[PDB]
From Swiss-Prot:
UniProt PTM comment: ISGylated.
Protein's gene: HSP90AA1
Residues bearing PTM N6-acetyllysine: 43, 69
Protein name: Heat shock protein HSP 90-alpha
Residue span of region Interaction with NR3C1: 1-208
Amino acid sequence: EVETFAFQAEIAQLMSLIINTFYSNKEIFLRELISNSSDALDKIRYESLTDPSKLDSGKELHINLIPNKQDRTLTIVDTGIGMTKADLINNLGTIAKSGTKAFMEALQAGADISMIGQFGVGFYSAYLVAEKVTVITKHNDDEQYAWESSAGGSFTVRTDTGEPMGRGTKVILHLKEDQTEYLEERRIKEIVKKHSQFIGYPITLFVE
Ligand SMILES: O=C(c1ccc(O)c(Sc2ccc3c(c2)OCCO3)c1)N1Cc2ccccc2C1
């Protein structure tokens, strides 16, 4: 059973700008997603201090980068706090409306797309390199969900019957055909070293 939702108008406009604007410095998507993982890991660690049972779904706190040339996917997996259905369906888009307008206005004022994370909407930089983004996520006391969007104004949510994750978030980037450099070991390593050097969790770059 698949539910289809419309993006808020401001978010659809943001995704169209990210897809249509000429901007060569696309590699910033990876820093934004690793930062979101790091924040998610921070939060489950923080909450586990007053409720240790929140780590019953997994004590290890890490980030995995997994390229797959055959599927043309780059997957970023973390064991952070995960997202609820409400996070996916309504609540994150609500928060993102304010930051989106501010980011739009800053871009008109001379800001650069690489500043997107200062407005809380860095996730959408995934569309610099991906034609479709699939997000698998598991929050404690909620189901495992698959969120998915190829832009165009809509996204889907379904309960996910794939491999159980325990807890956390998996962002699957289905790369555009001219963006396969982000499947190369040397390129991913260069980007992580340049932009994600001080992340406070082990980042493992898988190879094939
Ligand atoms: O679970 C996550 C997570 C982890 C790694 C990521 O790259 C992303 S990207 C992303 C962002 C927004 C979305 C979306 C994907 O999909 C559809 C709805 O809104 C999210 N949390 C949870 C959590 C709690 C506190 C602070 C920061 C965070 C982040």
